[PDB]
Amino acid sequence: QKYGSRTNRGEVVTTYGELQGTTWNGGSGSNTNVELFTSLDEPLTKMYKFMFQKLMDIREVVSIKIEELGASLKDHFQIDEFTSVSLPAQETVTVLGQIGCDSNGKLNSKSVILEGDREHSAGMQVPVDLSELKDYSLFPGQVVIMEGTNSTGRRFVPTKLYEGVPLPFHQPSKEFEECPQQMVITACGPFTTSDTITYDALKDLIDIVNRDRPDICILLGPFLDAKHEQIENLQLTVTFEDVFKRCLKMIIEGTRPSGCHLVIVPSLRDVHHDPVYPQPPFSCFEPAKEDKERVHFVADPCTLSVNGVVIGMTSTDLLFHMGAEEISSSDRFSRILRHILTQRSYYPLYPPNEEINIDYEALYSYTPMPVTPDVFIVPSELRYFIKDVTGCICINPGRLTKGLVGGTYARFLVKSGAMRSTCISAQVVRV
Amino acid sequence: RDCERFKFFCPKCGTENIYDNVFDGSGLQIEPGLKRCSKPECDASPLDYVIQVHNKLLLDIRRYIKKYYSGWLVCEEKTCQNRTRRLPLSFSRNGPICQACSKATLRSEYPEKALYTQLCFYRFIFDWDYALEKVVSEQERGHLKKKLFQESENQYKKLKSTVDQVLSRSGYSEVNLSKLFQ
Amino acid sequence: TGDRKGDLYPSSLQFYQHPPTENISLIEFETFAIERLKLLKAVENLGVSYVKNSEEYSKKLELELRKLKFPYRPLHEEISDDVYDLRRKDHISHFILRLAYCQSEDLRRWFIQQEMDLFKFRFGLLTKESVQEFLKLNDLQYVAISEDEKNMHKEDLMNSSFGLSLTKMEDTEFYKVPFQAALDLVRPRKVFLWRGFAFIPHKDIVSIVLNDFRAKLSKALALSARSLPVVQSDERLQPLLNHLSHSYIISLEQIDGFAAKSFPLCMRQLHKSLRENHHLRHGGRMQYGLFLKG
Ligand code: SF4
Numbered sequence: 077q078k079y080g081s082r083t084n085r086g087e088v089v090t091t092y093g094e095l096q097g098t099t100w101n102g103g104s105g106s107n108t109n110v111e112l113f114t115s116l117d118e119p120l121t122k123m124y125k126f127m128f129q130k131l132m133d134i135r136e137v138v139s140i141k142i143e144e145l146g147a148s149l150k151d152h153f154q155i156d157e158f159t160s161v162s163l164p165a166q167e168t169v170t171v172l173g174q175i176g177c178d179s180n181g182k183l184n185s186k187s188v189i190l191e192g193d194r195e196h197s198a199g200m201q202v203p204v205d206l207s208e209l210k211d212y213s214l215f216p217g218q219v220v221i222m223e224g225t226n227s228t229g230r231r232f233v234p235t236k237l238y239e240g241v242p243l244p245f246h247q248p249s250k251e252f253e254e255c256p257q258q259m260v261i262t263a264c265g266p267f268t269t270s271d272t273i274t275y276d277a278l279k280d281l282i283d284i285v286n287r288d289r290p291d292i293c294i295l296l297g298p299f300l301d302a303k304h305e306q307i308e309n310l311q312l313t314v315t316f317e318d319v320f321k322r323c324l325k326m327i328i329e330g331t332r333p334s335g336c337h338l339v340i341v342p343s344l345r346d347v348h349h350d351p352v353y354p355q356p357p358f359s360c361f362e363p364a365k366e367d368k369e370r371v372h373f374v375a376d377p378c379t380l381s382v383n384g385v386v387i388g389m390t391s392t393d394l395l396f397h398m399g400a401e402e403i404s405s406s407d408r409f410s411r412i413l414r415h416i417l418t419q420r421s422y423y424p425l426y427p428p429n430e431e432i433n434i435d436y437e438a439l440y441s442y443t444p445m446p447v448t449p450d451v452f453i454v455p456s457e458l459r460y461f462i463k464d465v466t467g468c469i470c471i472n473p474g475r476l477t478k479g480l481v482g483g484t485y486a487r488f489l490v491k492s493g494a495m496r497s498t499c500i501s502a503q504v505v506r507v
Numbered sequence: 508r509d510c511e512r513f514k515f516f517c518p519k520c521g522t523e524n525i526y527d528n529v530f531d532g533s534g535l536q537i538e539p540g541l542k543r544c545s546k547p548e549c550d551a552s553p554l555d556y557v558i559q560v561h562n563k564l565l566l567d568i569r570r571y572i573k574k575y576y577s578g579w580l581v582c583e584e585k586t587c588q589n590r591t592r593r594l595p596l597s598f599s600r601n602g603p604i605c606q607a608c609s610k611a612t613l614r615s616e617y618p619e620k621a622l623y624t625q626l627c628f629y630r631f632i633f634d635w636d637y638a639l640e641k642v643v644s645e646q647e648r649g650h651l652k653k654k655l656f657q658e659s660e661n662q663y664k665k666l667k668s669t670v671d672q673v674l675s676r677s678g679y680s681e682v683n684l685s686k687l688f689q
Numbered sequence: 690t691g692d693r694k695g696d697l698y699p700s701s702l703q704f705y706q707h708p709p710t711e712n713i714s715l716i717e718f719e720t721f722a723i724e725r726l727k728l729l730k731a732v733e734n735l736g737v738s739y740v741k742n743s744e745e746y747s748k749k750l751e752l753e754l755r756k757l758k759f760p761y762r763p764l765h766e767e768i769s770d771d772v773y774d775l776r777r778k779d780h781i782s783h784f785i786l787r788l789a790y791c792q793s794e795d796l797r798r799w800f801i802q803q804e805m806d807l808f809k810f811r812f813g814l815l816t817k818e819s820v821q822e823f824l825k826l827n828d829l830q831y832v833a834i835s836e837d838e839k840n841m842h843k844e845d846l847m848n849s850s851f852g853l854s855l856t857k858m859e860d861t862e863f864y865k866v867p868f869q870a871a872l873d874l875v876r877p878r879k880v881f882l883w884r885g886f887a888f889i890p891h892k893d894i895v896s897i898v899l900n901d902f903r904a905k906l907s908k909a910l911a912l913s914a915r916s917l918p919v920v921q922s923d924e925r926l927q928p929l930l931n932h933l934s935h936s937y938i939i940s941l942e943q944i945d946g947f948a949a950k951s952f953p954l955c956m957r958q959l960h961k962s963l964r965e966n967h968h969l970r971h972g973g974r975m976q977y978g979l980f981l982k983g
């Protein structure tokens with residue numbers, strides 16, 4: 077009722093980049109090449125056996141994460157030697173470690189501990205005293221290098237916190253120099269109103285897709301939300317798989333006129349899918365022979381290449397997860413986004429939030445960020461935004477539905493080699 | 508004996524039904540658990556709402572997987588009993604060293620064996636053939652190995668297929684024999 | 690060959706040369722380990738109690754193999770899925786026990802002995818055809834002569850094998866073996882030698898096979914003991930392997946109690962005297978023995 081009678085349909089709630097006309101048109105995915113970013117590491121494309129984690133394996137994965145990031149930072153900063161975190165230090169020493177909270181609550185400036193890696197510290201921890209640090213921004217699981225002293229052997233006092241070093245951007249090949257600008261419409265779940273299971277917002281978005289004919293449509297989960305009031309109280313008369321199959325058929329068949337490449341990203345809130353992160357791609361739907369080349373069932377997180385433009389995307393609410401734990405000396409979202417980019421992982425928070433199941437071997441294998449993406453799609457319960465963080469266009473299109481009321485989606489234009497202005501324009505628009 | 512039993516609320520009467528075996532009752536009065544509601548005044552058959560049973564089973568499996576991946580650790584020392592989500596990299600020969608007392612090992616609150624046994628139990632409470640062979644007696648087996656229960660057998664097979672599918676994706680739980688023998 | 694099978698397990702008997710490469714579950718690991726430990730302990734107990742050639746030994750060993758579901762009989766049908774499963778069991782369990790039984794020389798010897806015994810039994814249950822198949826699959830190359838060569842040396846073969854009739858000989862096929870393996874036959878001149886090979890008809894052969902097996906197995910155990918540090922770090926498998934060898938797989942005392950209440954006064958007196966002096970004259974012995982029989 078409330079959604080159907082909305083009056084702000086099509087309103088542009090946020091804008092960035094070159095001004096464009098009131099109407100956006102795309103190439104219908106004609107001269108479009110969508111693939112997974114070809115990096116050294118193989119992508120997650122199939123289910124991996126889970127529910128069996130050895131504490132030793134988790135220890136090894138965390139330790140190697142710290143060690144690898146510290147090695148890269150040491151080469152970049154020309155640091156001579158790292159020192160064990162636990163040992164006393166009367167003079168200033170450089171220490172590599174990861175941040176954490178001394179208790180189970182939320183991190184605060186008086187509850188910070190630094191845990192070293194196995195190579196340099198035997199995994200030992202030390203309390204941290206942030207009284208002598210003038211500026212800082214710390215979240216649990218953050219790999220840091222600090223110059224400080226430990227006079228009592230019991231409390232590390234940092235004096236310098238080395239800044240993060242983001243990965244270099246992608247240097248596109250000339251193969252896509254002559255390709256036109258590409259239009260991407262991105263939306264995130266939930267796709268149905270809190271009190272309905274009819275997917276009205278999804279129908280409106282599909283109508284928008286057919287109207288504007290974008291080159292890529294990135295749909296992020298959930299598609300059958302686990303927190304939907306109907307799902308939790310067991311009022312559904314059909315199986316979860318059937319509802320999800322109906323939703324996917326609606327999406328794929330309804331986009332036939334647009335000829336738009338669909339990129340489907342699962343969510344941890346998908347009640348019908350495996351609850352593990354990194355999430356494998358959906359595998360319960362077989363597109364018809366006429367839609368096989370258009371539909372891309374990708375994994376969470378995903379690094380996509382679109383005519384040379386690298387788009388990073390994750391369904392996980394990274395900003396909400398890290399905002400609850402980040403502590404700063406004095407834009408918060410920009411700080412968190414820079415933290416994500418500099419840590420070079422799509423989920424650097426450790427321990428994770430209570431709402432995400434992390435398989436740490438798969439996390440090690442499939443969460444490293446190959447490069448710094450040209451566009452980074454990070455849907456969040458927080459407010460929509462389009463930010464420029466260290467040259468990367470971070471887009472939060474919100475969620476298509478916000479409770480009983482309609483939500484928002486985003487549309488942006490990407491061209492490889494433009495001007496670094498790989499993102500010509502971007503807009504958060506209302507549904 | 509330490510596994511949670513399958514709780515299903517009747518859609519009609521709303522009374523909880525606890526399922527711990529494929530079959531309920533003794534002798535010729537034995538029938539599959541999902542044939543009749545636990546409330547005598549209730550005539551609703553849970554086998555009618557098998558879609559709801561499937562959905563509740565999937566939700567329960569999600570709940571147990573979430574419990575396992577929460578990664579809660581408790582100190583084995585009675586005088587410490589420190590409970591943390593964070594796994595420290597400082598290990599003794601027995602496992603992670605508790606950072607509250609620095610003298611005892613942290614044990615998983617919900618180990619992999621617990622989740623594996625829970626999934627195996629959910630498979631057990633829907634294993635028609637196993638119940639017939641092992642649990643059920645001779646006269647009861649004869650009474651249950653006839654018609655009038657074929658539909659219930661098919662529905663139970665479908666419900667067991669879900670737990671089998673979940674277990675097929677479990678590593679427990681995996682031993683790589685290549686790493687052992689070289 | 691249902692879903693994920695292959696030619697990896699041609700024959701029932703094997704020398705256990707190639708380690709398994711699969712990824713198995715912890716439950717499967719434990720089940721296989723314990724089951725083969727039961728099998729080997731049964732082999733040891735039956736060897737102590739009975740003569741290994743005895744029929745009681747064979748019957749009890751067959752019963753144990755059937756109870757634990759291990760391959761013991763051939764099947765001239767094909768590689769049925771169930772059969773495949775059994776063979777897989779055998780192959781994995783063996784190596785698991787190797788990991789369990791390589792830490793100490795004592796243990797090693799024990800393992801070897803039991804394994805040899807089992808192998809011998811299984812060989813004893815192999816039909817000649819199957820036997821040859823086995824001898825081929827492992828490149829043992831113990832003959833098999835052609836029919837044409839057999840006719841070529843017909844008279845020599847006839848005079849070589851004791852008590853072999855013309856037609857019956859025509860119904861038999863020989864094998865070619867290096868003479869270094871037929872020492873016990875050549876030494877008393879009961880098998881023909883031609884160009885360094887003995888022509889042996891279709892009891893002693895098992896011995897040679899076993900010798901080879903034992904050599905291999907000893908070598909393997911040495912290597913396993915050399916590769917122990919890699920396994921000790923896997924806590925999951927440490928409680929099992931480190932302690933598998935010590936893994937569990939009317940009463941006289943109450944008589945005194947009976948003496949309190951049920952025993953008639955005669956037996957009470959006899960029992961009191963017996964426990965006081967640990968000796969009874971003949972009459973007491975007879976009376977008390979008959980009562981305890983009763
Ligand atoms: S002989 Fe023993 S049982 Fe019989 S009357 Fe005497 S005391 Fe009683």
Ligand SMILES: [Zn+2]
Nearest residue numbers: 517520544549
């Ligand atoms: Zn009822």
Ligand SMILES: [Zn+2]
Nearest residue numbers: 582587605608
């Ligand atoms: Zn403790």
